[PDB]
Amino acid sequence: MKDFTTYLSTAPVLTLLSVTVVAGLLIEINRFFPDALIAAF
Amino acid sequence: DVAGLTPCSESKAFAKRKKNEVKALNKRLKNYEADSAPALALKATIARTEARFDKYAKQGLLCGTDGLPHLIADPGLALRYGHAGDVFIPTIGFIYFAGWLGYAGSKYLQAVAATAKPIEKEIIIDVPLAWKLLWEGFGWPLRAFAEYKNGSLMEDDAKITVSPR
Amino acid sequence: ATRPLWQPGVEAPKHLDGTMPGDFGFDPLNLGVNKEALNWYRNAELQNGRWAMLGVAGIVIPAELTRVGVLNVPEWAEAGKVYAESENAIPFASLLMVQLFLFNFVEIKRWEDIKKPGSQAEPGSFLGFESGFKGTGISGYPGGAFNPFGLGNSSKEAMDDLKWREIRNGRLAMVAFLGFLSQHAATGKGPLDNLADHLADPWGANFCSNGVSIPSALG
Amino acid sequence: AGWDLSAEVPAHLAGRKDLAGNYGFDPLNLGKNPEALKWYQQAELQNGRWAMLGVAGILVQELLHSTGLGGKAADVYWFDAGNNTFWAPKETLIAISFLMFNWAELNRMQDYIKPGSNVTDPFGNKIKYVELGYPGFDPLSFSKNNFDEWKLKEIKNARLAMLAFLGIVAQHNAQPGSPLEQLGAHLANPWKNHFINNGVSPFLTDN
Amino acid sequence: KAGNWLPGSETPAYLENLPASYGFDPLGLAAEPASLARFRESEVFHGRWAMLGAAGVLGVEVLGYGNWYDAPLPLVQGGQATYFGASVPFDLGTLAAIEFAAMAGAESFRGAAEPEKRVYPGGAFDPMGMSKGNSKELKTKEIKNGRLAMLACLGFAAQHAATGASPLEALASHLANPMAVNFATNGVSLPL
Ligand code: CLA
Ligand SMILES: CC1=C[C@H](O)CC(C)(C)[C@H]1/C=C/C(C)=C/C=C/C(C)=C/C=C/C=C(C)/C=C/C=C(C)/C=C/C1=C(C)C[C@H](O)CC1(C)C
Ligand SMILES: CC(=O)/C=C/C=C(C)/C=C/[C@H]1[C@H](C)CCCC1(C)C
Ligand SMILES: NCC(=O)NCC(=O)O
C-alpha cells in the first residue's frame, strides 16, 4: 500500500491524473455553461 | 457603438446569420422521424444554437459589417461603453488563476528545495504537501505583494550565476 | 496559547501565537506568515471592521426604524439614487471628489502612523494639535483625541477585553455586510424583508429557492 | 446552592457575601470577572429600583382606571397613555427628561467611577456614604438596624418587580386589556385562562 | 483654579495658574507647553472677536437696521450697502481689497511679537491703564465674557440655520410661546 500510493504520486501518474481531472472539469463546465464568449456577471 | 459597430441585437446581418444556420439544421432534420435518436439530437442542437444567438444578443456584443461579435481590449474605452466583460474582466480572471498556479508551484519548489533529496521530490511529488500549497496559493496577490514589499520574493544578482560576458 | 481555537483539535500555526486580539488560530491559507504583512493585515482588518460596523449600523438601524414607522428612509441599495434625484443635490462626480479629497488627507495621516507608530506626533507638524497623534504603541488604536470617554483607559487587561469585544463585533459586521450585498443581489428586497420572509417559510424561502444562488443550469 | 439545592455556588459568588440577595444563582457566569460583577450589581440595583417604581405605577394607575377615581387622566390604559394632552406636548417633555436625567445619571456615574468623590453639593452640603450602590439617601434612616435584612427586602422586592414588568409587557403583547383586567380574566375560570390558550405563546397549538 | 468643570474629578495638572481655568481638558490638547502657550492666546483672541461679534449682532438688530444675516445682501443685488443710512459707495471687490490690506498689516504686526505681547499688549491697547492693578481678576473677567460671547455667536449661527428667524425675533417667538416654540419643536435640532 505505501508503495502503491508512492507509485500513484509519481510524475507520470499524478500528472496524467491531474490533467484528466482538469480536463473533466472544463468539460463539465462547458457542458452546463456552454457557448460563453464573455464574462457576463 | 464604440467604433462603427452596431450592437448585435440591432445588426441585421447577425439575425440573418442566426436564420441561415438554423435553416441548415432544419434541412438536416427533414430526414428522420421526429422521435428517433438522430431527430432528438438535431432538435437539441437547434435549441442550443437558438439559445446561443439569443444570449449573444442579450449581452450586447458588437457586430461588424459581417454578423460576428467583436471584442474591446482597452480599459476605459470599454468601461465607459459597457464592454468590460470582453477583455478586462477575463484579464483579471486569468491573471488571478495563472498567478495561483504559478505561486503554488513556486512555493512547492521552495518547500522541497530544503530537504534531503530535492532532485527526488520533483519526480515523486509529495501529494499532501502539493495539495496544501495548492490551497494556500489562492491568496497569491496578497502573499506576493507582501514578499515584494519585503524584498524576499526576488534574489540579488550578486548571488545568481552568470555567463563569462 | 491554550485558548479556544477555530477548530478544536487543530493546533494554531506557529506565527499566530496568542497576542493579537481576536486570535483564534484561524489561518488556513497561511496569509500571515510574514510578520510585517501580519501587522498590515491586522491594521486592514481593523479598518474593514470599523467601516463595516458603521455601514451595517447605517443600513439596519434606519431600515428597522423605517419598518416600525419612523424616519421612512429608503432601502440601502436605492438610497444613492433617492438622494441623487433630489433638487439641490450635489453632482455625483463632485461629491465623490470632495469625499476622496478629504479622505486623502485623513488616510495618509493614518498611513504615516502605520509605518512608524509615532510618526505624526513630531512637534511642528500641525498647529499645536500634533500631540493628540502620539499613538498608543499599537497601530490602529490611536487614543488621545480619539476615544474621548477613556474606555478601557485603566486596567490594561480591561483594554485587552474591549479589544476582543470590538474585533468580534467587527467580524460579525463584515460577515453581515457581505450577507446584505449577496442578499440584495439575489432577492431585490431589504435585509429585514428577507428576515421576515425566511421566518414565514424557512424550508421554502431560503437561498436554494431564489434561483440566483444555485445555478438554474444545473437544476 | 441556595437558589437550587444540590447545585454549587459559582466560586465568585461563594465567598462574596456582601451582595444583596446572594443565592449562588449564576448559571451563565456573567459575573466571573470582578469588575463585571461590580458593574452588574449596580445594573441590578438600577433596574430593580426603576422597575419597582414602574410596576407600582402600572398597578396603581390601572387599579384607579378600573375602579374609577382619577378622572379623564387615569381612565385610559397604561400603554395608551400618549393620547392624554397634559400641560406639555410629548416633545418638550422628552427634551426636559433628557436634560434632567443627564444631570442625575452623570452624578451617579461620577459616583461610580471614584466611589465617594461626589457627595458634596455646590452649597457645601455634605452627605455621608456607605457602600457603592447605596448612596445613603435616608431621610428617615431605616438603615441603622439589621441593614443587611433591609437590603435583602429591597433586592427581593426589586427582583419580583422586574419579573412583574416582564410579565406586564409579555401579557400586553399576548392578551388585551389592563394587567389587573387580565388577572381577573385568569381568576375567572382559571383552568382555561392561562398562557397556553392564547394563540400567541406555544404557537404549536392552533398555528 | 476656581472651578472644577466636573465637581468631583481629577483635573489636568498643567491647568492650575491660568486665568479662568476650570480644568477643562479631557482631550489632552494642551499637554505640551507650546500647545497650551499657543491655545491661550488663540482663546483670548477668539473671545474678543466673539464679544465684538455678538455686540454687532445685537446692535444691528436692537437699533433697527436688520439682521446679522442680511448684512451682505445689499452688497450684490445690483449694489448699494447701507450703514446707519449712508450709501458707502463701495463695490464688492474694493471691500475685500481694503479689508485684506488692513487685516494683513494688522495681523502681521500683532503676531510678529513675543508670545505675551501677542495676547496681552499693554502699550496703547490699555489707554485707561486698567492693565495694572491686579489684572488676574480682570483677565478672568475677559476670558469668561469671551466664552459667553463665543457660545452666543455659535447660537446665533445655529438658530438662524434652523428656524431662519433672528436673535431678537427668535427671543420674541420663544417668550410669546415658550411651550411649542423651542429647539425641540422645529424639526431640525431634536429629531425624536
Ligand atoms: C510552478 C513552476 C513554474 C513557474 C513558477 C514558472 C515561472 C516563470 N517561467 Mg517557467 N517553466 C516551467 C515552470 C514554471 N515557470 C516548466 C515546467 C517549464 C518547462 C516547459 C518552463 C519553461 C519556461 C520557459 C521557456 C520560459 C519560462 C518563463 C517563466 C517566467 C515568465 C512567466 C511565464 O509566463 O512563464 C511561462 C510558463 C510556461 C511556458 C509553462 C508553465 C508550465 C506549467 C503550466 C506550470 C508548472 C506547474 C507545476 C508542474 C505544478 C506544481 C504544483 C505543485 C502543487 C506540485 C516566470 C517567472 C519565461 C521566461 O524566460 O521568463 C521571462 C520563459 O521563456 N518558463
Ligand atoms: C480571515 C481569513 C484568513 C484565512 O487564512 C483566509 C481567509 C479564509 C480568506 C480569511 C477570511 C476572510 C474573510 C471571511 C473576509 C471577508 C471580509 C469581508 C466580508 C469584508 C467586508 C467589509 C465590508 C465593509 C468594509 C463595508 C462597509 C460598508 C459601508 C461603508 C456601507 C456604506 C453604505 C451605507 C452605510 C448605506 C448606503 O445607503 C449605502 C452604502 C454607501 C453602501
Ligand atoms: C494663508 C496666508 O496667506 C499666510 C498667512 C500667514 C501667517 C499666518 C503667518 C503669520 C505669522 C507667523 C506665524 C510668523 C511670522 C509672521 C506672522 C505674520 C506673525
Ligand atoms: N515663531 C512664530 C510663532 O511662534 N507663531 C505662533 C502662532 O502661530 O501664533
Coordinates of C-alpha atoms in Angstrom, one line a residue, chain A residues 5-12 14-15 33-41, chain B residues 48 52 55-56 58-59 61 69 71 85-86 89-90 122-127:
Chain A
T5 CA 0.5 5.2 -3.1
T6 CA 4.1 6.2 -3.7
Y7 CA 3.6 4.9 -7.3
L8 CA 0.4 7.0 -7.5
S9 CA 2.4 10.0 -6.5
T10 CA 4.9 9.6 -9.4
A11 CA 5.1 12.3 -12.0
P12 CA 3.8 10.0 -14.9
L14 CA -0.1 12.2 -11.0
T15 CA 0.4 14.4 -14.0
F33 CA -22.5 26.6 -19.1
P34 CA -21.9 26.4 -22.9
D35 CA -21.0 29.0 -25.5
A36 CA -19.8 31.6 -23.0
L37 CA -17.9 34.2 -25.0
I38 CA -17.6 36.9 -22.3
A39 CA -17.6 37.1 -18.5
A40 CA -21.2 38.1 -18.2
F41 CA -21.9 38.6 -14.4
Chain B
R48 CA -28.6 25.1 -28.3
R52 CA -26.6 31.0 -28.0
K55 CA -27.7 35.0 -25.3
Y56 CA -25.2 36.9 -27.5
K58 CA -28.9 39.9 -24.8
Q59 CA -25.3 40.7 -23.6
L61 CA -21.8 42.3 -28.1
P69 CA -19.3 39.6 -32.4
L71 CA -14.4 42.5 -28.5
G85 CA -16.6 41.7 -19.8
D86 CA -14.9 41.4 -23.1
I89 CA -12.7 41.1 -16.6
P90 CA -11.3 37.9 -18.2
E122 CA 10.4 16.6 -8.2
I123 CA 9.8 13.2 -9.9
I124 CA 8.0 11.7 -6.9
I125 CA 5.7 14.6 -5.8
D126 CA 4.6 14.7 -2.2
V127 CA 0.9 14.9 -2.8

